[PDB]
mmCIF file of C-alpha atoms and ligand atoms in Angstrom:
data_model
loop_
_atom_site.group_PDB
_atom_site.id
_atom_site.type_symbol
_atom_site.label_atom_id
_atom_site.label_comp_id
_atom_site.label_asym_id
_atom_site.label_seq_id
_atom_site.Cartn_x
_atom_site.Cartn_y
_atom_site.Cartn_z
ATOM 1 C CA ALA A 1 -25.379 51.005 -24.810
ATOM 2 C CA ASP A 2 -29.554 51.732 -24.440
ATOM 3 C CA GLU A 3 -29.039 55.330 -24.809
ATOM 4 C CA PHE A 4 -27.479 58.356 -26.153
ATOM 5 C CA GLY A 5 -28.803 61.650 -23.901
ATOM 6 C CA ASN A 6 -30.313 62.008 -20.024
ATOM 7 C CA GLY A 7 -32.434 64.766 -18.156
ATOM 8 C CA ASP A 8 -31.607 67.813 -16.528
ATOM 9 C CA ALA A 9 -32.429 69.619 -12.632
ATOM 10 C CA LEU A 10 -30.494 72.367 -10.214
ATOM 11 C CA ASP A 11 -31.130 72.405 -6.257
ATOM 12 C CA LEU A 12 -27.385 74.014 -5.957
ATOM 13 C CA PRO A 13 -26.637 77.501 -3.641
ATOM 14 C CA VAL A 14 -27.194 80.583 -6.094
ATOM 15 C CA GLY A 15 -24.725 83.334 -4.635
ATOM 16 C CA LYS A 16 -22.408 84.408 -1.778
ATOM 17 C CA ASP A 17 -26.149 84.608 0.978
ATOM 18 C CA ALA A 18 -26.485 80.628 -0.293
ATOM 19 C CA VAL A 19 -23.209 79.616 0.132
ATOM 20 C CA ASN A 20 -21.999 80.328 3.606
ATOM 21 C CA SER A 21 -25.826 79.773 4.282
ATOM 22 C CA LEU A 22 -24.865 75.966 2.843
ATOM 23 C CA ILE A 23 -20.438 76.226 4.938
ATOM 24 C CA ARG A 24 -22.055 77.715 8.471
ATOM 25 C CA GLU A 25 -25.219 74.441 8.034
ATOM 26 C CA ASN A 26 -22.340 72.065 7.251
ATOM 27 C CA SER A 27 -19.483 73.237 9.141
ATOM 28 C CA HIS A 28 -19.073 69.555 10.073
ATOM 29 C CA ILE A 29 -18.230 68.876 6.299
ATOM 30 C CA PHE A 30 -17.790 71.962 4.611
ATOM 31 C CA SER A 31 -16.060 75.887 5.571
ATOM 32 C CA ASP A 32 -14.778 79.190 4.693
ATOM 33 C CA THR A 33 -11.415 77.451 3.244
ATOM 34 C CA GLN A 34 -11.649 73.724 2.832
ATOM 35 C CA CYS A 35 -14.023 71.182 1.549
ATOM 36 C CA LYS A 36 -13.869 67.572 3.200
ATOM 37 C CA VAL A 37 -16.319 65.871 0.640
ATOM 38 C CA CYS A 38 -13.791 66.757 -1.855
ATOM 39 C CA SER A 39 -10.788 67.179 0.162
ATOM 40 C CA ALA A 40 -9.728 69.991 -1.034
ATOM 41 C CA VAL A 41 -8.565 73.648 -0.133
ATOM 42 C CA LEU A 42 -10.560 76.505 -0.845
ATOM 43 C CA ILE A 43 -7.406 79.296 -0.524
ATOM 44 C CA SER A 44 -9.670 83.084 -0.990
ATOM 45 C CA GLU A 45 -13.236 83.030 -0.748
ATOM 46 C CA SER A 46 -13.737 83.800 -4.903
ATOM 47 C CA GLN A 47 -12.367 80.026 -5.533
ATOM 48 C CA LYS A 48 -14.821 78.401 -2.143
ATOM 49 C CA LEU A 49 -17.850 80.688 -4.424
ATOM 50 C CA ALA A 50 -16.632 78.933 -7.314
ATOM 51 C CA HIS A 51 -16.524 75.438 -5.638
ATOM 52 C CA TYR A 52 -19.687 75.666 -3.943
ATOM 53 C CA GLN A 53 -21.749 76.092 -7.198
ATOM 54 C CA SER A 54 -20.219 73.364 -9.270
ATOM 55 C CA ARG A 55 -21.616 70.591 -10.551
ATOM 56 C CA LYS A 56 -18.319 69.207 -9.570
ATOM 57 C CA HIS A 57 -18.996 69.084 -5.840
ATOM 58 C CA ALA A 58 -22.978 68.700 -6.114
ATOM 59 C CA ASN A 59 -22.325 65.183 -7.645
ATOM 60 C CA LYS A 60 -19.434 64.411 -4.719
ATOM 61 C CA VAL A 61 -21.864 65.699 -2.307
ATOM 62 C CA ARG A 62 -25.119 63.523 -3.463
ATOM 63 C CA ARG A 63 -22.402 60.286 -4.375
ATOM 64 C CA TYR A 64 -21.374 61.716 -0.786
ATOM 65 C CA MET A 65 -24.128 61.645 1.227
ATOM 66 C CA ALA A 66 -25.486 58.013 -0.586
ATOM 67 C CA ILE A 67 -22.175 56.699 0.972
ATOM 68 C CA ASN A 68 -22.821 58.700 4.805
ATOM 69 C CA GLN A 69 -25.993 55.561 5.631
ATOM 70 C CA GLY A 70 -23.576 52.707 6.854
ATOM 71 C CA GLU A 71 -19.638 50.996 8.044
ATOM 72 C CA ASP A 72 -17.985 47.270 6.500
ATOM 73 C CA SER A 73 -17.089 44.845 9.534
ATOM 74 C CA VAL A 74 -14.979 46.676 12.697
ATOM 75 C CA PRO A 75 -13.589 43.833 15.395
ATOM 76 C CA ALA A 76 -14.979 46.618 17.736
ATOM 77 C CA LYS A 77 -17.494 44.087 18.374
ATOM 78 C CA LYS A 78 -17.641 45.005 22.692
ATOM 79 C CA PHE A 79 -15.635 47.170 25.192
ATOM 80 C CA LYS A 80 -16.245 46.748 28.942
ATOM 81 C CA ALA A 81 -12.512 47.697 29.911
ATOM 82 C CA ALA A 82 -8.804 48.590 28.505
ATOM 83 C CA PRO A 83 -5.063 48.555 29.917
ATOM 84 C CA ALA A 84 -4.658 52.481 29.967
ATOM 85 C CA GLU A 85 -6.433 55.543 29.797
ATOM 86 C CA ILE A 86 -5.478 57.612 26.090
ATOM 87 C CA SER A 87 -8.882 58.433 24.430
ATOM 88 C CA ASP A 88 -7.537 62.008 23.021
ATOM 89 C CA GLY A 89 -3.591 60.121 21.289
ATOM 90 C CA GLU A 90 -3.252 59.870 17.719
ATOM 91 C CA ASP A 91 -1.329 56.527 18.649
ATOM 92 C CA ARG A 92 -1.806 52.932 16.390
ATOM 93 C CA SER A 93 -3.391 51.701 19.879
ATOM 94 C CA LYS A 94 -5.809 53.848 19.935
ATOM 95 C CA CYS A 95 -6.493 54.774 16.348
ATOM 96 C CA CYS A 96 -5.293 54.617 12.056
ATOM 97 C CA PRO A 97 -5.015 57.395 9.789
ATOM 98 C CA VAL A 98 -5.717 55.257 6.247
ATOM 99 C CA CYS A 99 -9.554 54.395 7.203
ATOM 100 C CA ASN A 100 -9.953 57.263 9.303
ATOM 101 C CA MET A 101 -11.324 55.327 12.769
ATOM 102 C CA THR A 102 -10.722 55.141 16.442
ATOM 103 C CA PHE A 103 -10.963 51.901 18.597
ATOM 104 C CA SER A 104 -12.307 51.270 22.360
ATOM 105 C CA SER A 105 -8.226 49.008 23.577
ATOM 106 C CA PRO A 106 -4.883 48.320 21.788
ATOM 107 C CA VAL A 107 -6.191 44.698 21.106
ATOM 108 C CA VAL A 108 -8.817 45.459 19.718
ATOM 109 C CA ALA A 109 -6.446 47.935 17.138
ATOM 110 C CA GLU A 110 -3.797 44.899 17.017
ATOM 111 C CA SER A 111 -6.872 42.511 15.590
ATOM 112 C CA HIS A 112 -7.963 46.105 13.593
ATOM 113 C CA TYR A 113 -4.158 45.749 11.285
ATOM 114 C CA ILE A 114 -4.606 42.936 10.640
ATOM 115 C CA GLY A 115 -7.942 41.912 9.532
ATOM 116 C CA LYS A 116 -9.835 42.681 6.922
ATOM 117 C CA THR A 117 -11.454 45.905 7.649
ATOM 118 C CA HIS A 118 -7.568 47.679 7.169
ATOM 119 C CA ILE A 119 -7.751 45.731 3.903
ATOM 120 C CA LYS A 120 -10.156 47.298 2.163
ATOM 121 C CA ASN A 121 -9.468 50.580 2.761
ATOM 122 C CA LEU A 122 -5.959 49.822 2.360
ATOM 123 C CA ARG A 123 -7.651 49.738 -2.277
ATOM 124 C CA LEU A 124 -9.942 51.970 -1.221
ATOM 125 C CA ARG A 125 -6.238 54.772 -0.660
ATOM 126 C CA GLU A 126 -4.869 52.831 -3.135
ATOM 127 C CA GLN A 127 -7.675 53.544 -5.798
HETATM 128 ZN ZN1 ZN B 1 -16.821 70.340 -2.766
HETATM 129 ZN ZN1 ZN B 2 -6.387 50.765 9.419
#
Protein backbone atom coordinates (compact mmCIF):
# COMPACT_ATOMS: atom_id res chain seq x y z
CA ALA A 1 0.00 0.00 0.00
CA ASP A 2 3.14 2.30 -0.20
CA GLU A 3 4.64 1.17 -3.61
CA PHE A 4 3.79 0.52 -7.31
CA GLY A 5 6.98 -1.41 -8.41
CA ASN A 6 10.11 -3.37 -7.30
CA GLY A 7 13.78 -4.10 -8.30
CA ASP A 8 15.13 -6.90 -10.58
CA ALA A 9 18.02 -9.47 -10.47
CA LEU A 10 18.93 -12.96 -11.87
CA ASP A 11 21.06 -15.86 -10.45
CA LEU A 12 19.17 -18.84 -12.05
CA PRO A 13 20.73 -21.67 -14.20
CA VAL A 14 21.13 -21.06 -17.99
CA GLY A 15 21.11 -24.05 -20.41
CA LYS A 16 21.15 -27.88 -20.06
CA ASP A 17 24.72 -27.97 -18.60
CA ALA A 18 23.73 -25.63 -15.70
CA VAL A 19 20.43 -27.54 -15.03
CA ASN A 20 22.23 -30.95 -15.00
CA SER A 21 24.95 -29.53 -12.65
CA LEU A 22 22.25 -28.01 -10.35
CA ILE A 23 20.42 -31.41 -10.21
CA ARG A 24 23.69 -33.31 -9.38
CA GLU A 25 24.76 -30.75 -6.69
CA ASN A 26 21.25 -31.04 -5.03
CA SER A 27 20.41 -34.79 -5.59
CA HIS A 28 18.58 -34.83 -2.17
CA ILE A 29 15.83 -32.37 -3.44
CA PHE A 30 16.20 -32.24 -7.30
CA SER A 31 16.37 -35.10 -9.88
CA ASP A 32 16.27 -35.86 -13.64
CA THR A 33 12.43 -36.42 -13.40
CA GLN A 34 11.15 -34.74 -10.14
CA CYS A 35 11.57 -31.56 -7.99
CA LYS A 36 10.76 -32.06 -4.23
CA VAL A 37 10.93 -28.30 -3.36
CA CYS A 38 8.02 -27.67 -5.79
CA SER A 39 6.62 -31.26 -5.18
CA ALA A 40 6.20 -31.79 -8.95
CA VAL A 41 7.07 -34.54 -11.50
CA LEU A 42 9.15 -33.83 -14.66
CA ILE A 43 7.94 -36.53 -17.15
CA SER A 44 10.51 -35.41 -19.85
CA GLU A 45 13.80 -33.45 -20.13
CA SER A 46 11.95 -30.50 -21.82
CA GLN A 47 9.74 -30.13 -18.68
CA LYS A 48 12.85 -30.56 -16.40
CA LEU A 49 14.78 -27.86 -18.37
CA ALA A 50 11.80 -25.43 -18.22
CA HIS A 51 11.04 -26.11 -14.50
CA TYR A 52 14.65 -25.65 -13.19
CA GLN A 53 14.97 -22.36 -15.23
CA SER A 54 11.44 -21.06 -14.24
CA ARG A 55 11.04 -17.86 -12.15
CA LYS A 56 8.38 -19.72 -10.04
CA HIS A 57 10.90 -22.50 -9.14
CA ALA A 58 13.57 -19.91 -8.15
CA ASN A 59 11.11 -18.08 -5.81
CA LYS A 60 9.99 -21.48 -4.29
CA VAL A 61 13.69 -22.44 -3.71
CA ARG A 62 14.38 -19.02 -2.04
CA ARG A 63 11.40 -19.57 0.36
CA TYR A 64 12.37 -23.24 1.01
CA MET A 65 16.04 -22.26 1.75
CA ALA A 66 14.82 -19.62 4.29
CA ILE A 67 12.47 -22.21 5.99
CA ASN A 68 15.29 -24.89 6.02
CA GLN A 69 17.05 -23.21 9.06
CA GLY A 70 15.02 -24.63 12.06
CA GLU A 71 11.96 -26.60 13.33
CA ASP A 72 9.12 -26.35 15.94
CA SER A 73 8.77 -28.34 19.26
CA VAL A 74 8.71 -32.21 19.12
CA PRO A 75 8.22 -34.68 22.10
CA ALA A 76 11.50 -36.55 21.11
CA LYS A 77 13.42 -34.51 23.83
CA LYS A 78 15.56 -37.50 25.09
CA PHE A 79 16.15 -41.25 24.42
CA LYS A 80 17.97 -44.34 25.91
CA ALA A 81 16.01 -47.57 25.03
CA ALA A 82 12.85 -48.89 23.23
CA PRO A 83 10.44 -51.93 23.59
CA ALA A 84 11.12 -52.93 19.90
CA GLU A 85 14.08 -53.01 17.41
CA ILE A 86 12.19 -51.45 14.40
CA SER A 87 14.52 -48.88 12.69
CA ASP A 88 13.56 -49.07 8.92
CA GLY A 89 9.71 -49.58 9.09
CA GLU A 90 6.67 -47.40 8.15
CA ASP A 91 4.47 -48.13 11.25
CA ARG A 92 2.66 -45.37 13.30
CA SER A 93 4.86 -46.32 16.33
CA LYS A 94 8.03 -45.15 14.39
CA CYS A 95 6.94 -42.48 11.81
CA CYS A 96 4.24 -39.94 10.76
CA PRO A 97 3.77 -39.13 6.98
CA VAL A 98 1.45 -36.11 7.75
CA CYS A 99 4.46 -34.31 9.33
CA ASN A 100 7.08 -36.40 7.40
CA MET A 101 9.03 -37.28 10.61
CA THR A 102 10.35 -40.30 12.62
CA PHE A 103 10.43 -41.23 16.36
CA SER A 104 12.98 -43.16 18.51
CA SER A 105 10.40 -45.21 20.56
CA PRO A 106 6.60 -46.01 20.33
CA VAL A 107 5.91 -43.83 23.45
CA VAL A 108 7.37 -40.75 21.63
CA ALA A 109 5.16 -41.54 18.59
CA GLU A 110 2.04 -41.93 20.84
CA SER A 111 2.92 -38.57 22.51
CA HIS A 112 3.34 -36.89 19.07
CA TYR A 113 -0.06 -38.12 17.69
CA ILE A 114 -1.89 -36.49 20.73
CA GLY A 115 0.26 -33.27 20.99
CA LYS A 116 0.44 -29.82 19.30
CA THR A 117 3.34 -30.98 17.01
CA HIS A 118 0.86 -33.08 14.95
CA ILE A 119 -1.93 -30.39 15.04
CA LYS A 120 0.49 -27.68 13.71
CA ASN A 121 1.10 -30.02 10.72
CA LEU A 122 -2.68 -30.78 10.23
CA ARG A 123 -3.16 -27.03 9.41
CA LEU A 124 0.01 -27.07 7.21
CA ARG A 125 -1.33 -29.97 5.00
CA GLU A 126 -4.91 -28.51 5.09
CA GLN A 127 -3.63 -25.04 3.95
ZN1 LIG B 1 11.05 -26.82 -8.50
ZN1 LIG C 1 2.26 -36.05 12.84
